[PDB]
């Protein structure tokens, strides 16, 4: 156990992201398009897979 607030603060940077389906890039959670050129700024995004 870390602490509940400290787990929230660490998960803000480590777990509450989104993943581009084409190029696996770690993206902002409210993003609409990937920031990478190689996937062509696609809008195929998924949430980052949580535990539990």
Partner 1 sequence: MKYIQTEQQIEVPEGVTVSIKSRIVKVVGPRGTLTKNLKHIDVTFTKVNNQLIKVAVHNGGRKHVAALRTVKSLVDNMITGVTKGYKYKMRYVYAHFPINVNIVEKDGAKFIEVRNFLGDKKIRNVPVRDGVTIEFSTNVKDEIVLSGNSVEDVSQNAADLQQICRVRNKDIRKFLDGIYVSHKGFITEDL
Question: Which CB, 15 or 39, lies closer to partner 1?
Answer: 15
First and final C-alpha spacing in the chain: 15
The number of beta carbons lying within 10 Å of the beta carbon of residue 45 is 19
Of 6, 29, 41, 46, the one binding partner 1 (CB under 8 A) is 6
Q: How far apart are CA 22 and CA 1, in angstroms?
A: 35
Q: Tokens 């700024």 identify what position? A: 41
Residue 11 in contact with partner 1, rule: CB under 8 A: yes
Question: Which CB, 7 or 26, lies closer to Zn ion?
Answer: 26
Q: For binding to partner 1 (CB under 8 A), which residues are involved? A: 1-2, 6-7, 9-15, 50-51
């Amino acid at each position: 156990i870390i602490e509940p607030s400290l787990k929230a603060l660490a998960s803000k940077y480590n777990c509450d992201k989104s993943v581009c389906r084409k190029c696996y890039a770690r993206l902002p959670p409210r993003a609409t398009n990937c920031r990478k050129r190689k996937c062509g700024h696609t809008n195929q995004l998924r949430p980052k897979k949580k535990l539990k």
